[PDB]
Design a protein around this ligand. Structure first.
Ligand code: GYX
Ligand code: GYX
Ligand code: ZN
Ligand code: ZN
Lengths: 315, 287
């Protein structure tokens, strides 16, 4: 007749919701889309081994919608489904510790995430969504599948898709605490005069255009609207890091003068990322592969630098 | 007092007057009678903007101080922006939004989009800039801006199923939702995506991916610039990755090109970066 078991559904693995299930129905019928440790179990009927387990459902009642928002800080209805679908893959990657950092053995065209994950472990960053804070702790410890799947979901990228690092840090920074970050710039044009500007949030820690923090501090040449080239330079920065990005170009990472950088060999549709880190010397981390050198020149796209408080001396 | 111009609180901390940062200015006599640091302002601000960035309002105000000085003529029935401050990407975005079926979630974007369609896009422009985390005058990209705004749009009814056939692995159907359901990066042609484009598979071979099923009111196809009544609209980019200019192409009674200026033609070939197509329900025929 009626054969049934007890489960918990959840969206955050924090609030669990007891349900009973008629074994005579596949999970979807009773819950909608249903997952077991990443596996889409919507179309399976309950096993005796399921008694007492926990299942992610979708926020299909008002209570779950609010819990999901408090945990993930997103209101895209498809977020949890897209996250779970990614997790079915990221749980299958291997995440070896290479030079003290969690990287990822190459799989499923994930080179940009490996380099993002290594970068994330070297910069001062506290996340706001509890899901990312929790998954990031796990990632730093070496169990990074959930972290990788959440980055994919927040970035609207699917498993196997070609990725760009600059876009990922910007997406993640929208979800990071940059409250104390401050950037002050002056732009001096021989025609137009001087203009100071203050920037906040992601733009206060990100600049696209030069890899050299020294050149940014000294002044970089950009076009002015009057037609002249003006020079823009950094007057004041209060932040724990900066990220500099540019189209891939041959570049000289010198030991000890930056934190880490990303190297891109390829073209705009297909290319490969490697991570370069400055430790006692220069290490090139490529998934599980590791190399060392005293100097480096290669096709660099992003350079990260340490910071606390900077004020220019150029008046 | 206010953070949203809807919920008012009788009364400072950070203070703004019609876009100009006046926190550090003292009131003038002409000012008589006219940041979210308490719970009333925190709740009102979140319900209106759908962001919890503490710095959001400062960047929105800074942008509005500039965008209120732009001019916004109606060209071929759409609000554009007369050129100022390297706003060609913002101009092309505003012309594009008014031409496809899309519903916003933050009350701020619906309200600003409605005002913009009527001709008052200053508030709308400061909101686009804040959501895309750009300051006024910055060089912008259509694909990136659209990715951020679609992140803030109701694309809930959109669904996409694709199949990938690899000579080693077999066939795999994959389902996408939200932004990935309406955007494809790799080809400008919806027809080729429906018929199939060759892209890499995880085993290292190049595989062929084609569209099995699409349910949505529009699609956006983008690719790096190349020479290129069959589409709704597209963006044309002249330049290189660091410096260039956007124009807009709309397919109506003929093909019209709006560049902040407007011309027409019966045929069109140029350096296209993004192309837009109409949809309701499409299903492929390889069965
Ligand atoms: C719109 C569209 O069609 N996107 C698309 C299509 C197919 C595959 C991919 C996935 N690959 C990417 O997204 C890349 C994007 C960025 N770059 C670096 C940072 C890079 C930066 C600047 C200039 C570059 C100029 C040349 C090469 C790289 C440049 C890394 C990879 C994306
Ligand atoms: C904080 C700050 O200042 N950020 C900043 C700085 C500089 C520039 C920009 C924005 N950059 C852009 O908008 C262009 C860049 C990319 N694409 C083009 C279509 C494009 C697409 C694909 C391959 C390409 C391959 C080669 C060339 C172009 C390619 C769109 C426009 C932002
Ligand atoms: Zn000038
Ligand atoms: Zn394969």
């Amino acid at each position: 007749e009626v054969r049934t078991i007890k489960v918990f559904t959840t969206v955050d693995n924090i609030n669990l919701h007891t349900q009973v299930v008629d074994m005579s129905m596949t999970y979807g019928q009773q819950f909608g889309p249903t997952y077991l440790d990443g596996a889409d179990v919507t179309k399976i009927k309950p096993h005796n081994s399921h008694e007492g387990k926990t299942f992610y459902v979708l926020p299909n009642d008002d209570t779950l919608r609010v819990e999901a928002f408090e945990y993930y800080h997103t209101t895209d209805p498809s977020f949890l489904g897209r996250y779970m679908s990614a997790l079915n893959h990221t749980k299958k990657w291997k995440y070896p510790q290479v030079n003290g950092l969690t990287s990822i053995k190459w799989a499923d065209n994930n080179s940009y995430l490996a380099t993002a994950l290594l970068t994330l472990q070297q910069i001062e960053l506290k996340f706001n969504p509890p899901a990312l804070q929790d998954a990031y702790y796990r990632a730093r410890a070496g169990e990074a599948a959930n972290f990788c799947a959440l980055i994919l979901a927040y970035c609207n990228k699917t498993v196997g898709e070609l990725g760009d690092v600059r876009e990922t840090m910007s997406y993640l920074f929208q979800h990071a605490n940059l409250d104390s970050c401050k950037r002050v710039l002056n732009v001096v044009c021989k025609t137009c005069g001087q203009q100071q500007t203050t920037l906040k949030g992601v733009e206060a820690v990100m600049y696209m255009g030069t890899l050299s923090y020294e050149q940014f501090k000294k002044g970089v040449q950009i076009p002015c609207t009057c037609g002249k080239q003006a020079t823009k330079y950094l007057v004041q920065q209060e932040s724990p890091f900066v990220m500099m990005s540019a189209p891939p170009a041959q570049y000289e990472l010198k030991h000890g003068t930056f934190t880490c950088a990303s190297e891109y060999t390829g073209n705009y549709q297909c290319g490969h990322y490697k991570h370069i880190t400055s430790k006692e010397t220069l290490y090139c981390i490529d998934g599980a592969l590791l190399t060392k050198s005293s100097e480096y020149k290669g096709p660099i796209t992003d350079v990260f630098y340490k910071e606390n408080s900077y004020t220019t001396t150029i008046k």
